[PDB]
Amino acid sequence: FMPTILSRFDMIFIVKDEHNEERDVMLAKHVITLHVSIDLAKLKKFIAYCRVKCGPRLSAEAAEKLKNRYIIMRSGARQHERDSDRRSSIPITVRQLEAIVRIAEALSKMKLQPFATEADVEEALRLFQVSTLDAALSGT
Amino acid sequence: EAYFRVESGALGPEENFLSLDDILMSHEKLPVRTETAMPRLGAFFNAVPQGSKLELPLWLAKGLFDNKRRILSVELPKIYQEGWRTVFSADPNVVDLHKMGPHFYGFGSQLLHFDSPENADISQSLLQTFIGRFRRIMDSSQNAYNEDTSALVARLDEMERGLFQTGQKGLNDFQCWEKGQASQITASNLVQNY
Amino acid sequence: MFCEKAMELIRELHRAPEGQLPAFNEDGLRQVLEEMKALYEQNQSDVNEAKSGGRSDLIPTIKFRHCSLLRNRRCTVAYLYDRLLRIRALRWEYGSVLPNALRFHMAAEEMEWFNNYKRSLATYMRSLGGDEGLDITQDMKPPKSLYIEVRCLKDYGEFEVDDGTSVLLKKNSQHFLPRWKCEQLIRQGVLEHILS
Amino acid sequence: MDAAEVEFLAEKELVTIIPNFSLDKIYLIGGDLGPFNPGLPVEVPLWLAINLKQRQKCRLLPPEWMDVEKLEKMRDHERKEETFTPMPSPYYMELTKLLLNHASDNIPKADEIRTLVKDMWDTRIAKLRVSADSFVRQQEAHAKLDNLTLMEINTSGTFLTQALNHMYKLRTNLQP
Amino acid sequence: MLPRSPPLPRGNLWELREAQRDYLDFLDDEEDQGIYQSKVRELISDNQYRLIVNVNDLRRKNEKRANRLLNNAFEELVAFQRALKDFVASIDATYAKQYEEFYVGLEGSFGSKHVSPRTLTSCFLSCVVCVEGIVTKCSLVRPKVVRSVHYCPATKKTIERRYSDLTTLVAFPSSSVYPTKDEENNPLETEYGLSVYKDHQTITIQEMPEKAPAGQLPRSVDVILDDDLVDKAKPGDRVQVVGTYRCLPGKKGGYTSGTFRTVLIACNVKQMSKDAQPSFSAEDIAKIKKFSKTRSKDIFDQLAKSLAPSIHGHDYVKKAILCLLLGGVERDLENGSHIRGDINILLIGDPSVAKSQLLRYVLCTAPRAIPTTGRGSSGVGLTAAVTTDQETGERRLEAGAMVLADRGVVCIDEFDKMSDMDRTAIHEVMEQGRVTIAKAGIHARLNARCSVLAAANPVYGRYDQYKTPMENIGLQDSLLSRFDLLFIMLDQMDPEQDREISDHVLRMHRYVSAAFMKKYIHVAKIIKPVLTQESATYIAEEYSRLRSQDSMSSDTARTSPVTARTLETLIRLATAHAKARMSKTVDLQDAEEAVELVQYAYFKKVLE
């Protein structure tokens, strides 16, 4: 998988697990959660009206939030890749920034809120700190 | 049944003061060209030149207007220009007066307080469009029963939806008398909460 | 331009065209009174400054601010007046007393307007005829027959018959009462007219 | 208005019943009635004939204009003429609804009277939307409706007048 | 959006005797404003058959006829075209006989007739409609007789014959027997020189893709062009045909199936998209001659700054892309030789440096630009491929991408995901300017004088700033010479630029003149400056200093080899820099503007 077809996306989720006996209690729980085996019928007809009635954009404060998050995300990738340069890695790009913005839009569309704010930008950024570190661990 | 909102006077000499339809109507933008400088307020668009093309709400350009065009002059949007005034004469039953709106007759009747030259030709478009689109609202509103009317009403404006909701309220009220159904006493506004 | 805050009071009432009283907005109302004050002073400054140095070229900057408050006045009386219509209905439809799913959405001064209107109305009503006038609140539909058959839908302590002969109202238990008494309760949601 | 009050105004027409109970003259604020001799006709307002029929206390009678022959001539006269022709009673729709629903067994040939009445109605409504389209089409300012009953008026009035007001406005917005 | 008029209504400012005698009165037109008597004469001075009419006028003149013409189009258009020959004989009867019959197009605003091939039901039979959509095939232009002229060698007479088929407005099926003995006595002989034929095509409009409900295979319709409307539409367009709708029956063996085939007998065609800009105002040309004179020092830099404002940084690349959008001067010597006059740019760099953006902007700015990728493009599908036909079954040569885009621009993104066997198919069409094909039954040479703008991701995914510029690019030194400008736009890691870039894009996510560069470059393209001996001795020196390795530097590697092919790219960039000034003579300030670009684009520096 090229670092470029991989970079055509914006969010990477890899799978993981543990094996402690309390973790194994969680596993014993999950056993019967499958052993046994808000509604969609209205969720779809909700989305059908939510997508078509909201015009969200960003507010002035989300701008200076994202600028200072993204600049400091870039600012270390240099010293990261200038020394180790393990023939493959993944740095930040403006396409990923636009992905962040269009994620915050979809978050603030859940609420019919015509103006997004800092209410969700940081949690989206942390979701992305998960989603990019996943490919960071996979690609090295 | 007893909540009688204040109606709209947007078709006569001047809009009503308390009508929530005219308030949202006049808010729509309109293009102007300024005649002087705009000192101490050039922040929005500190001073603004003379001879500049700006977009302002209609209510603002009510007082900022005079006969001599002291502060600014106005030019009509293209929907009322000579271009579309022939389209609305080809066949008026085809136009989407909700996209070209959603206040067509309301806006167009307030653009006559700007004493432009072509008024004698706007007040003839409106009259000849409303007359054109009549036999399709008199007949698709008194003859659409227990149907999904949300597609017979997708291309109308606030002056016409108010009539399509008066055709239906008189169809669905005779068809409820014919079936011995308008004798039972019912809850009026509480079934609105339910 | 200006007036982007008042236009969030109106564009909310325009979404409820059924006549349902929404929750009062003290927040936006305060937020628009503040802008009124701000523009008022920031314009009066240059008003009296145009008599203290001759800056008559600021005359436009007066109108652009003089009228731009009238707007914020309109859009705050209409809202305050519209909500006084959706309230009077609750005297011709529900009745003299309201449940507190309603008296919780009115701002605490609209209750005084209500209890004034209701009292003046009850004053006028008793003035029509000799004996305690004629209660024009009832009688909304032409009378069809003399007795009606109702059927309860919620519990209700003990309904009264004028002669002191009370009647209990359990759920799903139908009576045969004079429609002269059941109108008040059918129009609220308690009873129900079955034998149409 | 609304149909349920036209129906109220229509319950003042006089009809003829045949009671089966004894009662002496009654002095109503709207006239006098009686006396009620068992097995003898008497003329009362509709709202009482219906209410007595429901309580099994009378036996209605068909009004004279409610004949299956004269009606089959009205139904043709209406389709020939090109204007609103005069009708048996100003409230024939409500009569031939209330009667035929509540006393259909005391009226012979009810389900032909009913169809002829409906045939007349379905024409007098077609002439209206032609007389209410030439009005707009030619921008008149007056229209003489000849023999319209209150019901035809009320089924399409609150739309016609409301769509003519919006036309007067558009037609007189250039004078000042 | 609903197209309720061929003229886009938003921004247009920036018996059968009554019909024939009413059309004539309409075509008088003198007494009100003389709109059509200014057009009949206009076409007589151009020798045209048909004139375009506005039904919008017919409405205001006479509503009854305007309605009777949109619902009985045949009987009304056979009376229009008669009372038009009548009115042209009323000006010049000598001209009124040169042509057999006149025609009359239509245009304006039809009420409900503006339909798509999906809505064209069978309630529009014999009714003027106005169909919109894409052409997806054409037929082979063929003659079709409308009159014969025979001759009797024995009797010395001359008989004629008038023909008619089901594709007329009168529709009587005549037989093409070509009489040879009218009366059994005398023999006949046809005279082709004196007969009358006409042209005939058959195209297929198809519903627009973005207007289909996407669940089906979009509907189609068959058009029958004719009489010099013929070649007015090629496959892949967006037309607005305005023609009568018709059903044409048939019978195979005296027994007809009720099923018919319906066609559209076009009588006007309109390309919806404006794909040209020669319409300039005298005020505009005044502005242009002002701007070209104001400052000759700073007009190139000032032009390039305003090129792509949506992008931050990359001033050099914008400068060179402007040079591309202008072009050099193609010299063809007297003996027949030829020297190309185009510039081919290559951009390599790390991901997300707005490369694709520059490409997508150069696409829309220049007219006749074609996009292409590095995997959705084979080595033969770029230039020309041999195939056959379905009707005739004989081979022909379908034109690739880089032959459609002649005198234009070709934008190749991800030029590196293209296999080695595919680049090689370009070395002839990027320098010599014409493609040569010698396949099985095909021997052709197509003209493909174009210019290439290409973008390629470096090897190793990212530009290792330590290896060398030659190991970060896979291209061999034969292809690297064709592209005369190689820009290494490695992701600007400097913290400053990212700041303003983020500011800009975020401002965009919170929502020189733009439409003036179009006219200015469409005008300054034609100028053809000529070298002068003051600079021609400066270039002939900067090259001989470029070609010497020593004078370059140490710790400096070479991105591409310097040959005698960069010499005449100096000359091309120069006479493309003296095209912005509208100068017409290159001076020493030009041959120095175009040398620093090279000095910057050729030599790179390596770190450790």
Q: State the amino acid at position D131 in one-letter form.
A: S
Per DSSP, what are the bridge partners of residue E240? E132
Q: Test E114 with B94 for CB contact under 8 angstroms.
A: yes
CA A123, A129, A134 angle in degrees (round to 5)?
135
Chain E: closest CA distance from residue A77 (Å):
9
Pairing relationship of beta strands B53-57 and B72-74 according to DSSP bridges: unpaired
Q: Using CB atoms, which residue from A58, A70, A71 is nearest to E510?
A: A58
Tell me chain E's radius of gyration from C-alpha atoms.
Answer: 31
Tell me the chain D residues in contact with residue C142 when contact means C-beta distances shorter than 8 Å. 4-5, 7-8
Q: Test A58 with E464 for CB contact under 8 angstroms.
A: no
Rounded to whole angstroms, the Cα distance separating A108 from A65 reads 16
| Joined tokens for residue A36 | 């046994």
Domain that holds residue B98: 1-180
| Joined tokens for residue E184 | 């059994």
Give the containing element (helix H, strand E) for E515.
helix E514-524
Q: Using CB atoms, which residue from B38, B59, B181 is nearest to C60?
A: B38
Rounded to whole angstroms, the Cα distance separating B93 from E113 reads 12
Q: Is E476 exposed, middle or buried (0-12, 13-18, 19+ CB in 10 A)?
A: exposed
Q: Is D69 exposed, middle or buried (0-12, 13-18, 19+ CB in 10 A)?
A: exposed
Instruction: Locate the chain E residue with the closest alpha carbon to B78.
Output: E10
Matching residue, tokens 């603004």: B48
Domain map (residue ranges) of chain D: 1-66, 67-175
Q: Of the candidates E390, E321, E305, E417, which has an alpha carbon nearest to the alpha carbon of residue E362?
A: E321
End-to-end Cα, chain D, rounded Å: 36
Q: Does E14 contact chain B (CB < 8 Å)?
A: no
Let me know if chains A and D touch, i.e. at least 3 Cβ pairs under 8 angstroms: no
Q: Does B180 contact chain D (CB < 8 Å)?
A: yes
DSSP assignments along E245-278, one per residue: EEEE---SSS---S--EEEEEE----B-S-----
Report the helix count and the strand count for chain D, using DSSP H and E. 9, 4
Tell me the chain B residues in contact with residue D7 when contact means C-beta distances shorter than 8 Å. 177
Rounded to whole angstroms, the Cα distance separating E490 from E607 reads 14
Q: Of the candidates E120, D64, E490, B58, which has an alpha carbon nearest to the alpha carbon of residue C1?
A: B58
End-to-end Cα, chain B, rounded Å: 17
Q: Does D5 contact chain C (CB < 8 Å)?
A: yes
E488 secondary structure, DSSP code: E
Residue B170 to residues B163, B175, D47, D161, Cα–Cα distance (Å): 11, 9, 25, 13
Instruction: Locate the chain D residue with the closest alpha carbon to C147.
Output: D51
Give the class (CATH, top level) of D1-66: alpha beta
Which value in Å is the resolution of this experimental model? Answer: 6.8
Mapped onto helix, strand or coil, the DSSP state of residue B72 is strand
Tell me the chain A residues in contact with residue E495 when contact means C-beta distances shorter than 8 Å. 71, 74-75
Chain D: closest CA distance from residue B163 (Å):
7
Q: Is the torsion defined by CA of A44, A49, A55, A61 positive or negative?
A: negative
Mapped onto helix, strand or coil, the DSSP state of residue C7 is helix
Q: Test B91 with E10 for CB contact under 8 angstroms.
A: no
Pairing relationship of beta strands E50-51 and E103-104 according to DSSP bridges: parallel
Query: Do residues A108 and A116 lie in contact, with contact meaning Cβ atoms separated by under 8 Å?
Result: yes
Q: Does domain D67-175 have CATH number 1.20.58.1020?
A: yes
Residues in chain C: 196
Residues 6+ positions from C71 with CB-CB distance below 8 Å = B59, B60, C2, C3, C6
Which phi-psi region, left, alpha or beta, contains residue A105 (left: φ > 0; alpha: ψ -120 to 50)?
alpha
Tell me the chain C residues in contact with residue B1 when contact means C-beta distances shorter than 8 Å. 93
Q: Does E67 contact chain B (CB < 8 Å)?
A: no
Rounded to whole angstroms, the Cα distance separating E59 from E57 reads 5
DSSP assignments along C61-96, one per residue: HHHHHHHHHHHHHHHHHHHHHHTTHHHHHHHHTT-S
Residues 6+ positions from A138 with CB-CB distance below 8 Å = A12, A14
Q: Of the candidates E358, E378, E379, E380, which has an alpha carbon nearest to the alpha carbon of residue E369?
A: E358
Matching residue, tokens 């408050």: C69
Per DSSP, what are the bridge partners of residue D151? none
Rounded to whole angstroms, the Cα distance separating C49 from C38 reads 17
Tell me chain C's radius of gyration from C-alpha atoms.
Answer: 26
Q: Does E116 contact chain B (CB < 8 Å)?
A: no
Q: Does D115 contact chain C (CB < 8 Å)?
A: no
Q: Residue E396: how many CB atoms within 10 A of its CB? A: 12
Rounded to whole angstroms, the Cα distance separating E400 from B4 reads 70
Q: Residue E309: how many CB atoms within 10 A of its CB? A: 10
Query: Do residues B65 and B71 lie in contact, with contact meaning Cβ atoms separated by under 8 Å?
Result: yes
Q: Of the candidates E330, E310, E324, E356, which has an alpha carbon nearest to the alpha carbon of residue E597?
A: E324
Residues 6+ positions from E330 with CB-CB distance below 8 Å = E338, E339, E340, E341, E449
Q: Test B94 with E2 for CB contact under 8 angstroms.
A: yes
| Joined tokens for residue E548 | 């010497």
Write out the binding residues of E: 357, 397-399, 401
Pairing relationship of beta strands D26-28 and D31-33 according to DSSP bridges: antiparallel
Residues 6+ positions from D27 with CB-CB distance below 8 Å = none
Question: Which CATH architecture is the domain C5-126 placed in?
Answer: Up-down Bundle (1.20)
Query: Do residues E586 and E535 lie in contact, with contact meaning Cβ atoms separated by under 8 Å?
Result: yes
Q: State the amino acid at position D57 in one-letter form.
A: K
Matching residue, tokens 């059941």: C182
Query: Do residues E203 and E138 lie in contact, with contact meaning Cβ atoms separated by under 8 Å?
Result: yes
Tell me chain A's radius of gyration from C-alpha atoms.
Answer: 19
Note whether residue B187 is domain-resident.
no
What number of CA atoms fall less than 13 Å from residue A4's CA on the CB side? 14
Per DSSP, what are the bridge partners of residue D121? none
Size of interface A-E (CB pairs under 8 A): 60
| Joined tokens for residue E190 | 């046809």
End-to-end Cα, chain E, rounded Å: 59
Q: Is E167 exposed, middle or buried (0-12, 13-18, 19+ CB in 10 A)?
A: middle
Q: Using CB atoms, which residue from B86, B93, B96 is nearest to E2?
A: B96
Query: Do residues B17 and C4 lie in contact, with contact meaning Cβ atoms separated by under 8 Å?
Result: no
Residues 6+ positions from D50 with CB-CB distance below 8 Å = D11, D98, D102
Q: Does E503 contact chain A (CB < 8 Å)?
A: yes
Q: Using CB atoms, which residue from E2, E13, E110 is nearest to B90?
A: E110
Rounded to whole angstroms, the Cα distance separating E404 from E399 reads 7
Residues 6+ positions from D76 with CB-CB distance below 8 Å = none
Size of interface B-C (CB pairs under 8 A): 116
Q: State the amino acid at position B121 in one-letter form.
A: D
Q: Does E457 contact chain A (CB < 8 Å)?
A: yes
C157 secondary structure, DSSP code: E
Mapped onto helix, strand or coil, the DSSP state of residue D97 is helix
Instruction: Locate the chain C residue with the closest alpha carbon to D54.
Output: C145
Q: Of the candidates A135, A97, A101, A98, which has an alpha carbon nearest to the alpha carbon of residue A121?
A: A101
What number of CA atoms fall less than 13 Å from residue E16's CA on the CB side? 12
**Interaxial angle between packed helices E73-80 and E82-89, expressed in degrees from 0 to 180 and rounded to the nearest 10:** 10
Q: Test B95 with E4 for CB contact under 8 angstroms.
A: yes
| Helices assigned H by DSSP within chain A | 21-35, 40-50, 60-81, 94-109, 118-139
| Joined tokens for residue A47 | 């989305």
Strands (DSSP E) found in chain C: 147-148, 156-159, 167-169, 177-178
Rounded to whole angstroms, the Cα distance separating E225 from B7 reads 56
E426 secondary structure, DSSP code: G
Number of domains in chain B: 1
Q: Using CB atoms, which residue from D5, D51, D54 is nearest to C142?
A: D5
Give the containing element (helix H, strand E) for E316.
helix E315-326
Let me know if chains E and A touch, i.e. at least 3 Cβ pairs under 8 angstroms: yes
Rounded to whole angstroms, the Cα distance separating E586 from E571 reads 10
Query: Do residues E326 and E521 lie in contact, with contact meaning Cβ atoms separated by under 8 Å?
Result: yes
Pairing relationship of beta strands E485-488 and E345-348 according to DSSP bridges: parallel
Q: Does E502 contact chain A (CB < 8 Å)?
A: yes
What number of CA atoms fall less than 13 Å from residue B114's CA on the CB side? 25
Residues 6+ positions from A95 with CB-CB distance below 8 Å = A7, A10, E351, E352
Matching residue, tokens 């004949």: D67
Matching residue, tokens 């190793």: E460
Q: What residues in chain D have their Cβ under 8 A from chain B's Cβ atoms?
A: 2-4, 7, 97, 101, 129, 132-133, 136-137, 139, 155-156, 158-159, 162-163, 166-167, 169-171, 173-174, 176
Residues 6+ positions from E251 with CB-CB distance below 8 Å = none
Q: Using CB atoms, which residue from E5, E11, E112 is nearest to B87?
A: E5
Pairing relationship of beta strands A115-116 and A57-58 according to DSSP bridges: parallel
Q: Of the candidates C69, C9, C19, which has an alpha carbon nearest to the alpha carbon of residue C41?
A: C69
CA C39, C40, C44 angle in degrees (round to 5)?
115
Q: Of the candidates E527, E525, E543, which has an alpha carbon nearest to the alpha carbon of residue E535?
A: E543
Chain B: closest CA distance from residue E281 (Å):
21
Q: Does C7 contact chain B (CB < 8 Å)?
A: yes
Q: What residues in chain A have their Cβ under 8 A from chain E's Cβ atoms?
A: 2-4, 7, 57-58, 60, 63, 66-67, 70-71, 74-75, 77-78, 81, 85, 87-89, 91, 93-98, 101
Residues 6+ positions from C85 with CB-CB distance below 8 Å = B3, B4, B5
| Joined tokens for residue E522 | 């469409």
Mapped onto helix, strand or coil, the DSSP state of residue E319 is helix
- CA torsion, ordered D9, D14, D20, D22, to nearest 10 deg: 90
Residues 6+ positions from E65 with CB-CB distance below 8 Å = E19, E22, E23, E26, E58, E76
Mapped onto helix, strand or coil, the DSSP state of residue B29 is strand
| Joined tokens for residue E75 | 């009987």
Tell me chain B's radius of gyration from C-alpha atoms.
Answer: 21
Tell me the chain E residues in contact with residue B90 when contact means C-beta distances shorter than 8 Å. 4-5, 56, 59, 108-111
Tell me the chain D residues in contact with residue C145 when contact means C-beta distances shorter than 8 Å. 51, 54
Q: Of the candidates E102, E80, E67, which has an alpha carbon nearest to the alpha carbon of residue E27?
A: E80
Let me know if chains D and C touch, i.e. at least 3 Cβ pairs under 8 angstroms: yes
Q: Test E4 with B81 for CB contact under 8 angstroms.
A: no
Rounded to whole angstroms, the Cα distance separating E186 from E159 reads 12
Q: Using CB atoms, which residue from D3, D136, D166 is nearest to B177?
A: D3
Pairing relationship of beta strands E239-241 and E131-135 according to DSSP bridges: antiparallel
Q: Of the candidates A110, A120, A123, which has an alpha carbon nearest to the alpha carbon of residue A51?
A: A110
**Interaxial angle between packed helices D110-124 and D70-80, expressed in degrees from 0 to 180 and rounded to the nearest 10:** 20
Q: Does E514 contact chain A (CB < 8 Å)?
A: no
* CATH number of residue B14's parent domain: 1.20.58.2050
Chain A: closest CA distance from residue E507 (Å):
8
Query: Torsions phi, psi of E221, nearest 5?
Result: -165, 155
Q: Using CB atoms, which residue from B63, B184, B189 is nearest to C93?
A: B189
Rounded to whole angstroms, the Cα distance separating E293 from B45 reads 32
Q: Is the torsion defined by CA of E495, E497, E498, E503 positive or negative?
A: positive
Rounded to whole angstroms, the Cα distance separating C35 from C57 reads 24
E211 secondary structure, DSSP code: G
Please state whether the peptide bond connecting residue B102 to the residue before it is cis, i.e. omega within 30 degrees of 0.
Answer: yes
Max CA pair span of chain E: 106
Max CA pair span of chain A: 54
Q: Of the candidates D20, D6, D24, which has an alpha carbon nearest to the alpha carbon of residue D152?
A: D6
Q: Is E341 exposed, middle or buried (0-12, 13-18, 19+ CB in 10 A)?
A: buried
Residues A111-115: contacts with CB under 8 Å, at least 24 apart: A112/A50, A112/A53, A112/A54, A113/A54, A113/A56, A114/A54, A114/A55, A114/A56, A114/A57, A115/A56, A115/A57, A115/A58, A115/A59
Residues in chain B after which the chain is broken, C→N over 2.5 Å:
45
Rounded to whole angstroms, the Cα distance separating E402 from E420 reads 18
Rounded to whole angstroms, the Cα distance separating A69 from E502 reads 11
Residues 6+ positions from B131 with CB-CB distance below 8 Å = D136, D137, D139, D167
Query: Do residues E83 and E23 lie in contact, with contact meaning Cβ atoms separated by under 8 Å?
Result: yes
**Interaxial angle between packed helices D92-102 and D3-10, expressed in degrees from 0 to 180 and rounded to the nearest 10:** 80
Rounded to whole angstroms, the Cα distance separating C100 from B63 reads 45
Q: Of the candidates E132, E342, E355, which has an alpha carbon nearest to the alpha carbon of residue E237?
A: E132
Rounded to whole angstroms, the Cα distance separating E77 from B120 reads 35
Rounded to whole angstroms, the Cα distance separating E445 from C176 reads 102
Q: Using CB atoms, which residue from B40, B71, B187 is nearest to C189?
A: B187
- CA torsion, ordered E516, E519, E521, E526, to nearest 10 deg: -160
Per DSSP, what are the bridge partners of residue E205? E135, E221
Per DSSP, what are the bridge partners of residue B53? B33
Q: Using CB atoms, which residue from C58, C77, C89 is nearest to B3?
A: C89
Size of interface B-D (CB pairs under 8 A): 72
Rounded to whole angstroms, the Cα distance separating E322 from E300 reads 9
DSSP assignments along E529-557, one per residue: -B--TTTHHHHHHHHHHHS-STTT-SSEE
**Interaxial angle between packed helices A118-139 and A60-81, expressed in degrees from 0 to 180 and rounded to the nearest 10:** 20
Q: Is C183 exposed, middle or buried (0-12, 13-18, 19+ CB in 10 A)?
A: buried
Query: Do residues E6 and E56 lie in contact, with contact meaning Cβ atoms separated by under 8 Å?
Result: no
